[PDB]
UniProtKB/Swiss-Prot annotation:
Function: Lysozymes have primarily a bacteriolytic function; those in tissues and body fluids are associated with the monocyte-macrophage system and enhance the activity of immunoagents.
Protein known as: Lysozyme C
GO biological process: antimicrobial humoral response; defense response to bacterium; defense response to Gram-negative bacterium; defense response to Gram-positive bacterium; inflammatory response; killing of cells of another organism
Residue intervals of the C-type lysozyme domain: 1-130
Disease listed for this protein: Amyloidosis, hereditary systemic 5: A form of hereditary systemic amyloidosis, a disorder characterized by amyloid deposition in multiple tissues resulting in a wide clinical spectrum. AMYLD5 primarily affects the viscera, and the predominant clinical features are renal dysfunction of varying severity, and intra-abdominal bleeding. Inheritance is autosomal dominant.
Major subcellular site: secreted
GO cellular component terms attached to this protein's record: azurophil granule lumen; extracellular exosome; extracellular region; extracellular space; specific granule lumen; tertiary granule lumen
Family the UniProt entry places it in: Belongs to the glycosyl hydrolase 22 family.
Record-linked Gene3D superfamilies: 1.10.530.10
């Protein structure tokens, strides 16, 4: 599923993402926008290291989920990477929360540093009722 901006914003707020480990909702919106275009079925194979990025937050298979084909992988979220391709983002949110609980925070995603950090991210939640 491809979420519309405000629909996703409201979904994230209900899932407890606003201010989770100091991360405002607009930052999470910014991250989802640049990672997958708010698409829960997006996947990116990294030919270079044999890992794959899954879902709306493009969570990597080397560290967070199991896809069985990534060498030296850990499954820190204790989930099949399939779980990150569902229309219901609950699993992906619980995994994203796990990612940030690591002494990197939102900076864990280089896309966030490139496109969101130090920028005016208010546009992502404007008019959404969140």
């Amino acid at each position: 599923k491809v979420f519309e901006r405000c629909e996703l914003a409201r979904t994230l707020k209900r899932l407890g993402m606003d201010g989770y480990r100091g991360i405002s909702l607009a930052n999470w919106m910014c991250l989802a926008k640049w990672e997958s275009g708010y698409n829960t079925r997006a996947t990116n194979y990294n030919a270079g290291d044999r890992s794959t990025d899954y879902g709306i937050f493009q969570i990597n298979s080397r560290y967070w989920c199991n896809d069985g084909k990534t060498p030296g992988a850990v499954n820190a979220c204790h989930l099949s990477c399939s779980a990150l391709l569902q229309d219901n983002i609950a699993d992906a949110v619980a995994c994203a929360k796990r990612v940030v609980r690591d002494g990197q925070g939102i900076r864990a995603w280089v896309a966030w540093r490139n496109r969101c950090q130090n920028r005016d991210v208010r546009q992502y939640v404007q008019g959404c009722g969140v």
